[PDB]
Amino acid sequence: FTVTEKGWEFVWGNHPPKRFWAQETAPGNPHGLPHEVITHYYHRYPMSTILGLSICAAIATVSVAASTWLFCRSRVACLTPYRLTPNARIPFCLAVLCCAR
């Protein structure tokens, strides 16, 4: 049987009722090695963990993608006025920074 924190009770024949109560001793260690905290909060709070990891992965993916997008657009906006000059001569400092030729 599955016993939760809200209680559980059985009666075995002519015996009196036995009530039981679950308490929060989940397998895992919540203090390090981050594949151990995820199993701990998965056996502990199963529904909330998948939603939390989904939204944190989504925000991390959107942030890395948008930062790469903005950096590549800014590199293009820097190097384009020095790549339309016939005698291209991108500076030195912008060659080291913007990773030019």
């Binding site: 001793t25 890395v64 820097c78």
Partner: protein, 442 residues
């Protein structure tokens, strides 16, 4: 002094609080609920039992013809049979071959054991909650049956307490109830006069001694065997016995929230649902002044034991200094820790050892002792039992067990991405301004 609070609807567990008048001594209040009933308004309709087909002796006339004289007994069948040559032990009964006549007459009456073996069909609605509180307000304790409608006060020592109505109108009992043998069932019995043959209520006596019972038991008289004096019938079996053979289990074993159904008043017990609000009309005489109670100076709190078990598995230790030796209240204003005792008796330079209960992994609460606030901080550890035989003595706060390591993983992998996007936005702004500066040249 009007003080309102709220108590959870759960027996056995002591509920503690204090009242802080802004310039006086704190007044501790303790309420421990013992037995919380729920008594519906119960309305008897009918009882039922086993029936007992009574049969009159066969009226026999030799070379004659009888008639059917009714009696208006319950389900009273009667029929007249012709062409009968009955026998007694001392030979034949008539001399006529044909044109003899035997009358069968049967009726339904209720059984002889109806008094001690019957089932009561009721109707219930609009229950009434009633608790056995054990209140202590300023070391003055009473034990009184309070009623928990929004009125009907309990009065003691000038203090008026009105424990208001439950937050939920839930009852375990349905609109219809059958009581049999100390146990109570949610059965949809038919109405009076609607009793069907072969099922529950084929007999419907209005009370136990009503002497007017409705009976629909599918009784049909049959023709007697040639040469015998008997009354043969054929009816559907006892619907009360067939109800007893099926009998989906009692409400004692099936009730939600763990109720405890009892019999002599039909009532439920200790249904852990809802919450009781409270009103305290406290007179001004009980508020003792500040300087008539001890008051600490230079106190400090440390945690000896810290296990986030179900009961009081934490020990905080307070080293204090105060220039009196008396008792004073302790309380935790948040629901972070649930303390065990409500008062600590003090020396002038000793230490205090309190017992609390908590769900947190890194407990940081602000303990209120006599009139001051210390901060008790530590680290709790998981308990050794998976399953205990007592309920919970604390409240699971949302974000209670978040374990500072995981706070660090949520701060870095979610706040650091914001740092990435703001330095990307700053870099984009600087690039746009530098392109516009470059094209200022013409």
């Amino acid at each position: 002094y009007e003080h309102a609070t709220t108590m959870p609807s759960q027996a056995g567990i002591s509920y503690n609080t204090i009242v802080n008048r802004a310039g006086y001594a704190p007044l501790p209040i303790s309420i421990t609920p013992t037995k919380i009933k729920l008594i519906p308004t119960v309305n008897l309709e009918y009882v039922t039992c086993h029936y007992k087909t009574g049969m009159d002796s066969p009226a026999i006339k030799c070379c004659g013809s009888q008639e059917c004289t009714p009696t208006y007994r319950p389900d009273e069948q009667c029929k007249v049979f012709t062409g009968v040559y009955p026998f007694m032990w001392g030979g034949a009964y008539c001399f006529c071959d044909t044109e003899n006549t035997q009358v069968s007459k049967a009726y339904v009456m209720k059984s002889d054991d109806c008094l001690a073996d019957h089932a009561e069909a009721y109707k219930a609605h609009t229950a009434s909650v009633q608790a056995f509180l054990n209140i202590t307000v300023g070391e003055h304790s009473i034990v009184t049956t309070v009623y928990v409608n929004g009125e009907t006060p309990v009065n003691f020592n000038g203090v008026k307490i009105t424990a208001g109505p439950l937050s939920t109108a839930w009852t375990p009992f349905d609109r219809k109830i059958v009581q049999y043998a100390g146990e109570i069932y949610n059965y949809d019995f038919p109405e009076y006069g609607a009793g069907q043959p072969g099922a529950f209520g084929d007999i419907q006596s209005r009370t136990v001694s009503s002497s007017d019972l409705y009976a629909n038991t599918n009784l049909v008289l049959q023709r007697p065997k040639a040469g015998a004096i008997h009354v043969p019938y054929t009816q559907a079996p006892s619907g009360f016995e067939q109800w007893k053979k099926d009998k989906a289990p009692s409400l004692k074993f099936t009730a939600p929230f763990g109720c405890e159904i009892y019999t002599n008043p039909i009532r439920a017990e200790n249904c852990a649902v809802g919450s009781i609000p409270l009103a305290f009309d406290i007179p001004d005489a009980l508020f003792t002044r500040v300087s008539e109670t001890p008051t600490l100076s230079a106190a400090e709190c440390t945690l000896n034991e810290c296990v986030y078990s179900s009961d009081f598995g934490g020990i905080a230790t307070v080293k204090y200094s105060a220039s009196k030796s008396g008792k004073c209240a302790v309380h935790v204003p948040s629901g972070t820790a649930t303390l065990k005792e409500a008062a600590v008796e003090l020396t002038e330079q000793g230490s205090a050892t309190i017992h609390f209960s908590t769900a947190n992994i890194h407990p940081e609460f602000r303990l209120q002792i006599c009139t001051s606030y210390v901060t008790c901080k530590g680290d709790c550890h998981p308990p050794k039992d998976h399953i205990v035989t007592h309920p919970q003595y604390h409240a699971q706060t949302f974000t209670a067990a978040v374990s500072k390591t995981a706070w660090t993983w949520l701060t870095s992998l979610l706040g650091g991405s914001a740092v990435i996007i703001i330095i990307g936005l700053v870099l984009a702004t600087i690039v746009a301004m530098y392109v516009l500066t470059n094209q200022k040249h013409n």
